[PDB]
Amino acid sequence: AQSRTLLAGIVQQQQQLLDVVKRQQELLRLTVWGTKNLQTRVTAIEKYLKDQAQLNAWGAAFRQVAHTTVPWPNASLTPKWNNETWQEWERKVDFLEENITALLEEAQIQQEKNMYELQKLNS
Amino acid sequence: AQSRTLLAGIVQQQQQLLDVVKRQQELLRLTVWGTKNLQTRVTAIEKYLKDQAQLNAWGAAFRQVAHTTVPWPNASLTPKWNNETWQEWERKVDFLEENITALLEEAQIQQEKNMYELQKLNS
Amino acid sequence: AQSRTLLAGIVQQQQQLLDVVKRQQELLRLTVWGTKNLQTRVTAIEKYLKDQAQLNAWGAAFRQVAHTTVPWPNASLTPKWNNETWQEWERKVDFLEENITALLEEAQIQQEKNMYELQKLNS
């Protein structure tokens, strides 16, 4: 009189939900890559912006033996606020990812044990 | 003859899935911070780009009492399309976050009630 | 003697978890839009950076009939590495999204069948 068939569907449904949850984590990693890739491009752009400061006046002297170079800062380089804040941001993600793996690992073990118990009822 | 042990595992498994789901929301917030932080840096870069337009020709005159300044636009500032579209983007997230909290709140209450019912069977 | 009420809560709880999971996918799409929108702005900024290279020296000649134009590259345009890598990044998301829809579709069908079975016990 036990509803094993209903439980098999419920137990199976939990597995499908677990897979989508794990799948979301993989998708999240791809999004993180896009953001980080933009930062690498940003580092190159600031370097180029500095070159623009070097460009000031070409041939601005035809009766003098001197050239005026005005390399005024262009890209504001972040020394501590972004690096310290970004490292903390990445670190929070690292602890959160480790926590999700722990719950997924226990869920996988528990998931197999729950199904095994169902078999024991009518093994 | 009831499979309370199997149900305890199934009920417990749902709680573990709920935690990972809530955990994903926290991780998502960290990703949003990285994107928003880049925008703050972008606002500073456009300001610097405007300064580059000001740089045009230094000392390009040694027999005249005048200086040619050509501050031609450099960074295209967004007045309505990004602000109106970005506000809508943030607003959609705000309604979605509120909807997730409602489902999590009901799940927590329902989760405790489901376990309490299991205790009533053999309390 | 069956715990249908407990199962109804467990079955209902799974539906609530499924909704939040689907809700996370919608939220993820909004985050992807923010990242892609920044790239469109970046494409415009590189074009503006090229214009800065054109600006070199205005009026740097008052006794000559010539102008010195030095349009040295400014923004490093990505021809193959970002496009090929970004297309692969978007493609991975496309396969992952299709996989999530398949699991959600099966879960919806299975979810309705699990509830229908509960009704059959006492229909």
What HEC string does chain A produce?
A: CCCHHHHHHHHHHHHHHHHHHHHHHHHHHHHHHHHHHHHHHHHHHHHHHHHHHHCCCCCCCCCCCCCCCCCCCCCCCCCCHHHHHHHHHHHHHHHHHHHHHHHHHHHHHHHHHHHHHHHHHCC
CB contacts of B45 in chain A (<8 Å) are 45, 49, 75
Of B89, B107, B111, the CB nearest to C33: B89
Residues 6+ apart with CB under 8 A from A25: A97, A100, B24
- Check: CB of residue C74 under 8 Å from CB of residue C49: yes
Contact between residue B40 and residue C40 where contact means Cβ atoms under 8 Å apart: no
**Neighbouring subunits of B (3+ Cβ pairs under 8 A):** A, C
**B-chain residues near C30 (CB < 8 A):** 89, 92-93, 96
Other chains touching A, judged by 3 or more CB pairs under 8 Å:
B, C
Q: How many residues does chain A have?
A: 123
Can you tell me the distance from the alpha carbon of B93 to that of A53, in angstroms, rounded to the nearest whole number? 40
> Could you tell me how far CA C12 lies from the centroid of its own chain?
31
Query: Which of C105, C34, B92, B27 lies closest to A27 in space, CA to CA?
Result: B27
Interface test with B, best of C10, C68, C111 (most B CBs within 10 A): C10
List of residues 6+ apart from B117 with CB closer than 8 A: C3, C5, C6, C9
State the structure-solving technique: NMR
Whether residue C69 contacts residue B56, with contact meaning beta carbons closer than 8 Å, is answered with: no
Assigned token pair, C91: 């493609």
* 8 Å CB contact of A7 and B9: no
CA distance A3 to C2: 8
Residue extents of the structural domains in chain B: 1-123
Q: Are B10 and A114 in contact (CB under 8 A)?
A: yes
In SS3 terms, chain B reads as CCCHHHHHHHHHHHHHHHHHHHHHHHHHHHHHHHHHHHHHHHHHHHHHHHHHHHCCCCCCCCCCCCCCCCCCCCCCCCCCHHHHHHHHHHHHHHHHHHHHHHHHHHHHHHHHHHHHHHHHHCC
SS3 of C36-75: the string is HHHHHHHHHHHHHHHHHHHCCCCCCCCCCCCCCCCCCCCC
Contact C99 A55 (CB under 8 A): no
Q: Between chains, do C30 and B118 touch, taking CB under 8 Å as contact?
A: no
Please state, in angstroms and as integers, the Cα–Cα distance from residue A3 to each residue in A8, A90, B120, C111, C116, following that order: 9, 47, 20, 15, 13
- C interface residues, B as partner, C-beta within 8 Å: 1, 3, 5-6, 9-10, 12-14, 16-17, 19-21, 23-24, 26-28, 30-31, 33-35, 37-38, 41, 44-45, 48-49, 51-52, 55, 57-63
What spatial distance separates the first Cα and last Cα of chain B, rounded to whole Å?
16
**φ, ψ for residue B67, nearest 5 deg:** -130, 135
Domain C1-123, CATH: 1.10.287.210
Record the tokens describing residue A43, joined without a space. 């580092």
**Buried/exposed code over C19-51 (b: 16+ C-beta within 10 A; e: otherwise):** ebbebbbebbebbeebbebbeeeeeebbebbeb
Q: Which residues 6+ apart lie within 8 Å of A38 measured at CB?
A: B38, C35, C38, C39, C42
Chain B residues within 8 A of C19 when measuring between CB atoms: 103
Whether the CB-CB separation of B45 and C44 falls below 8 Å is answered with: no
What is the rounded radius of gyration, in angstroms, for the C-alpha atoms of chain A? 29
For residues C59-72, one letter each, b for 16 or more C-beta atoms within 10 angstroms of the residue's C-beta and e for the rest, the string is: bbeeeeeeeeeeee
